[PDB]
Assembly symmetry: C6
Homo-oligomer: 224 residues x 6
Amino acid sequence: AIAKMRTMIEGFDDISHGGLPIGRSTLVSGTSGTGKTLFSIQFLYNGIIEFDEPGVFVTFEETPQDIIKNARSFGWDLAKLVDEGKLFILDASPGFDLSALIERINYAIQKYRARRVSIDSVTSVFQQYDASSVVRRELFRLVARLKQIGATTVMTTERIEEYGPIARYGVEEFVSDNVVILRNVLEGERRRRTLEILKLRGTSHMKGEYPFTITDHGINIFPL
Amino acid sequence: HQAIAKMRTMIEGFDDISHGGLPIGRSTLVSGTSGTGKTLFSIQFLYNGIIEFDEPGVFVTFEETPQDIIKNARSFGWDLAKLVDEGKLFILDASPDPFDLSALIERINYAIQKYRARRVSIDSDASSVVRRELFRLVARLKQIGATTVMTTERIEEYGPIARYGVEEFVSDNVVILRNVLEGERRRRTLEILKLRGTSHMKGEYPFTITDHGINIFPLGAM
Amino acid sequence: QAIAKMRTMIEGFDDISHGGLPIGRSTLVSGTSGTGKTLFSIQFLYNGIIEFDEPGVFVTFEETPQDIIKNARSFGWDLAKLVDEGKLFILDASPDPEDLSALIERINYAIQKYRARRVSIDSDASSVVRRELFRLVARLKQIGATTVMTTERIEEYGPIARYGVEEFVSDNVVILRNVLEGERRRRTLEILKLRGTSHMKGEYPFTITDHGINIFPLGAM
Amino acid sequence: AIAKMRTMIEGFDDISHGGLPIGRSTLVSGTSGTGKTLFSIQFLYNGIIEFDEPGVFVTFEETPQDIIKNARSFGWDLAKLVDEGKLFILDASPGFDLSALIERINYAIQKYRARRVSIDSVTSVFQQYDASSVVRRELFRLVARLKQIGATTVMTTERIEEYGPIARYGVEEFVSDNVVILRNVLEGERRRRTLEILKLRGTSHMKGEYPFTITDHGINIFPL
Amino acid sequence: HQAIAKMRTMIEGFDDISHGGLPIGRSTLVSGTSGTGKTLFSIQFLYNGIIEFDEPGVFVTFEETPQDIIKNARSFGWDLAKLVDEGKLFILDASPDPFDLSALIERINYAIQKYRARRVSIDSDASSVVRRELFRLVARLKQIGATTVMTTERIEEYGPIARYGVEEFVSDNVVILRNVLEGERRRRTLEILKLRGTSHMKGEYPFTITDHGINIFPLGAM
Amino acid sequence: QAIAKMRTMIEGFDDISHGGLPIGRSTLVSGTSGTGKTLFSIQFLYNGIIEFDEPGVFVTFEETPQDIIKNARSFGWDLAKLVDEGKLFILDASPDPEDLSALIERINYAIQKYRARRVSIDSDASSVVRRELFRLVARLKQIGATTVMTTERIEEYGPIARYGVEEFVSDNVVILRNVLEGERRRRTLEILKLRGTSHMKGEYPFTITDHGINIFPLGAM
Ligand SMILES: Nc1ncnc2c1ncn2[C@@H]1O[C@H](COP(=O)(O)OP(=O)(O)NP(=O)(O)O)[C@@H](O)[C@H]1O
Ligand SMILES: Nc1ncnc2c1ncn2[C@@H]1O[C@H](COP(=O)(O)OP(=O)(O)NP(=O)(O)O)[C@@H](O)[C@H]1O
Ligand SMILES: Nc1ncnc2c1ncn2[C@@H]1O[C@H](COP(=O)(O)OP(=O)(O)NP(=O)(O)O)[C@@H](O)[C@H]1O
Ligand SMILES: Nc1ncnc2c1ncn2[C@@H]1O[C@H](COP(=O)(O)OP(=O)(O)NP(=O)(O)O)[C@@H](O)[C@H]1O
Ligand SMILES: Nc1ncnc2c1ncn2[C@@H]1O[C@H](COP(=O)(O)OP(=O)(O)NP(=O)(O)O)[C@@H](O)[C@H]1O
Ligand SMILES: Nc1ncnc2c1ncn2[C@@H]1O[C@H](COP(=O)(O)OP(=O)(O)NP(=O)(O)O)[C@@H](O)[C@H]1O
Ligand SMILES: [Cl-]
Ligand SMILES: [Cl-]
Ligand SMILES: [Cl-]
Ligand SMILES: [Cl-]
Ligand SMILES: [Cl-]
Ligand SMILES: [Cl-]
Ligand SMILES: [Mg+2]
Ligand SMILES: [Mg+2]
Ligand SMILES: [Mg+2]
Ligand SMILES: [Mg+2]
Ligand SMILES: [Mg+2]
Ligand SMILES: [Mg+2]
């Protein structure tokens, strides 16, 4: 019914029954340090390395140089992909309206013939601009235009509780076709990472929380 | 003359729980957190009305495009495109362009009249204003004579019925879809909280979503 | 010397209240949605009429008279007949799709016109709510009405009613609950308070059936 | 160290080690239907019957006629005490300033030579007048002037949780010399009434919750 | 030259828990719900300073009148009237008449100078403003060289340290008095949360209030 | 290729962080009152100076330099000597009893003057807080400083910091807890996150003694 794109992130394409729905956005929400940026980098990296699908990474608060430096933790050379024209890192770092940003993103997608897009994290621009009032409207604008473009998008968001609202403004999951929750639960002085696919409109997926670890090779999910 | 009559949904298990289906000529609120099956329920209500009883339906969408409603319904082997082309289903696009309630209600009445519709699904910041506006909608749908499913959002599995804390009190009928997380596993359940002027089963009934749509099971099952 | 009470004839209730509702006073009936508030308030009037020939005035704020009448047919009650016979008056204060003191005067006009002994009223700042609810309860008391007034609440074991004041201005308070535990619902009724008189304490389970509300003994089911 | 006045309410003078501190105010707080008005009526009634100490009852929302009628539940004839000049029921029923009310109360105390005063409930006037802003200030005014007068006062207040703040505005206990909490706890579908003396400045008292019942004879506390 | 020195309170048990008493020349916040023993603690601090060490004290009261402070202290057999008449204790009446902080601080400094006081007790709506103003007071008391107990209110036994959520962060030293209700019984406990630049015992220590004042006991006692 | 780290020499910490704090970045250290935040931040500079001759700048917002110095004598540290020798600079931003970008320029002036490699910063609308904290972290990064910045929180197992944003703009996050259970306190340290590198997970108990912070093994005591 709906076609999916392989993420090649260990375990994820099993949990999602094939990968992420093509041409749609997937919200990846989680508290700080849960692995959201990593998930969004792996998504682009694997598309390039495994499938020669170019990617655009939109960063708000982290600098492109820090994204590149941090990815060396995993032995991934993103500078080389940028040099080869296969990755573009769009720096979106400092009435509220995402129209201008959407034009920039669209330019990059057409220029680099990108099939994958990662946006990390649009929560920060809403919050820095004090734009909670229009989050539902502007996220809708962004999600809708990315769909018109045909991009397959990972969109990260913040949340402040492990078991609580999906995201910070309490509306983000409802305008998203697809929702993944990363958790980092503290119990008995120990942390455990888990991943959940809450929803994929129009298709099936495994349910509940699945454990994962972050290693030198990135995210490893165990699809019990 | 007699107590209220019901219209069969044909959603497996639901007509048992509702003691006959949804109260005719009224609206039923179906509330749930994200991914609980709300849009599915409202689609299945229309689809079954068309296939089983040749009762035309109007689907009102506020954020999903008609194309995506049609695409997603193929997950269950339902061909909504065929139904739209036969004039049995009309998808009213009220989604924004990548709010006027009176204008909306007029469009809905227009569609109900044009397509002879007997079923309607509507899917989906002061609580005082929400109460007044939802009341107007419910009341005018009842004047038109529609049997309606209207979905609403909620945030917590075992908190308020719906986002604003008022929606269930202006509704005649309320169904709650939950997606309960316990010990890392999810369990879907459906509950008929209330049907004014008629009987229904009580409590949460477990259900699944499969290639066949929603299938509801007996109490404490699964 | 006690407070005089009028029988509700609602199965079990007149035992729990030790004689029924205090006459000439208002009783708050609070509950989450679908707990039986409107039913309790209709059954109070209906029984008043059928058992005692005591006329009743039903004040509706959101449901229409025709829907009230239709819904009561669930219980085999013919409210339309009672309106035709002048025994029941349904005052429609529900808004048209498409002022407190004024409403009170229409209520009093109805009470005097129909010589009603029973009144049911069904159903954003706590200060204003407290002041206006006090004026309504006080005016009904001066009129001599015995009143059931319903209110909303949003949690089964939280505040008595939405604004956190409603129970303090009421002489009498009844709480209807619909408790969800282990995927099952259990309806319970509690008389929290009756000023000046006695009543059973705590929660009593009840059912709603074809014959209305039926309240059961302690710790039952 | 500080002299106390017997309440003669069954069990209470044991819990308070002698009764209420003379010349001071005692806050009696509780959720609705916990017995606050009853406690405040018994305090005056017993002063009159047992000790020929006249009393003034200040009522805000309940009418004097209802106070009198309700007290017949217990076989107490308050109309007769009013007729004999031993009880005065002051009807205080409908910038915020209790000065005028305080003058009325003072007039009644002097006129009737009252030793006991019950005020039930000043919470309602604060709330009806939307005067949360000045609760601490105005309660202080009232408590201080009653102390200057020499009255021994029971002052009831509302609260909305059994285990939670002492009173509605979160300040009332701090301007009171003495604090009593009435609770009506629901557990396992059963209610239990308890009374606690939280604090009596400058003197001793029993601690914790003590069970009580309300009967035809009024409040019965069991001072375990 | 060396780490901070302490002044003995002589409150039974307290100087053990504080590893020597209260840090000299600083303020110690003593926070508690109503009836926890805050005023008692602050009175005992001065009284013991006078009786045991001939160190004069100033008591600043904001709501209890001096007459009532004196009256209530007779519960413990303490004759504060005698101490005021000997010029060893001064009760500064800052209570309202049945707010100017700079003016208050000047009066406190005046009293400290007039009576040669070495100990001070102060007893007792935007959190930002409270933070700034409390900071000014603490800082100016430290400039004067007072060793001070300052009491504050709190609402919950195991919630915020104090009413506004900022008071402990501008204090050098924090003591929490609790009155914990469990199974219908109350248990009083005292905790030294923090003393900057010095050591102290940790956790809650049970205490009683009796005719002798506050008596603190070893851990897990009673 | 890893992220380079600088050793804190705080007992146990450099093991938990797998080498120390990421160089040229800021580390958030959040905690309720009296959890050891100022101590952690002083020990970071002190060890930098004593172990590695790396000068440090301490920015204080409420405690005075003289109190910082007095309090450190608890640990047998002579900070006054280090200020005299030009190895430690305490920037006083505390208010006098009786503008972000400006503060940043005074910090940078201090860093350049004293050739500091280490910086500690100690310590009402979430939007504004997020924007200003981002500007500070970004400017410190451009300057090249390795920074410890303390923040407050009010619950041991609640939000990381007061405004619910502080941890998201930080590259590195450490949480100090002081957990009260059964009338006993237990101090724990947690490294929540270090962008781009590895670290041990969960809570590690620690003590504060005459020698500063000592962090213990897993599940200890
Ligand atoms: N080589 C590695 N081995 C193990 N864990 C690693 C490694 N590199 C990074 N990590 C972990 O990955 C985490 C970073 O994940 P990241 O994807 O930046 O989280 P995030 O959710 O985007 N954080 P934030 O943006 O602040 O909300 C670090 O906190 C480390 O715990
Ligand atoms: N063929 C299928 N088999 C199993 N599950 C499916 C299938 N198709 C869809 N689903 C599930 O149905 C869910 C979507 O249901 P849907 O009715 O769109 O939820 P919703 O409550 O309307 N979500 P939202 O609009 O965000 O409030 C997905 O999240 C999948 O879990
Ligand atoms: N014949 C019947 N048998 C059993 N239950 C019935 C019958 N008729 C109605 N009910 C129940 O009565 C409930 C309606 O009670 P009602 O008195 O309308 O509640 P309420 O508290 O006033 N609801 P609301 O005003 O919408 O918040 C329905 O939800 C059914 O569960
Ligand atoms: N004769 C009696 N026998 C037993 N209980 C009685 C009797 N008379 C009254 N009661 C109880 O006393 C309660 C009234 O107590 P009352 O002192 O009015 O409470 P309150 O706390 O002042 N209520 P409120 O003013 O609404 O906050 C009633 O709710 C009954 O439960
Ligand atoms: N002789 C005594 N024996 C036993 N307990 C006593 C004695 N004298 C006083 N008390 C107790 O001490 C408590 C008063 O302590 P106090 O120091 O005034 O509390 P506080 O915390 O200052 N109250 P508040 O000002 O409302 O915040 C009383 O509530 C009694 O329980
Ligand atoms: N020599 C010592 N031995 C043991 N503990 C000590 C010693 N010196 C100080 N402490 C402890 O260290 C704590 C102060 O730590 P500090 O680093 O000031 O905490 P903080 O989190 O910065 N406090 P604050 O800024 O007031 O919220 C004191 O409360 C003592 O418990
Ligand atoms: Cl991991
Ligand atoms: Cl399922
Ligand atoms: Cl039932
Ligand atoms: Cl009782
Ligand atoms: Cl004690
Ligand atoms: Cl320690
Ligand atoms: Mg990130
Ligand atoms: Mg949907
Ligand atoms: Mg109703
Ligand atoms: Mg009362
Ligand atoms: Mg005090
Ligand atoms: Mg500090």
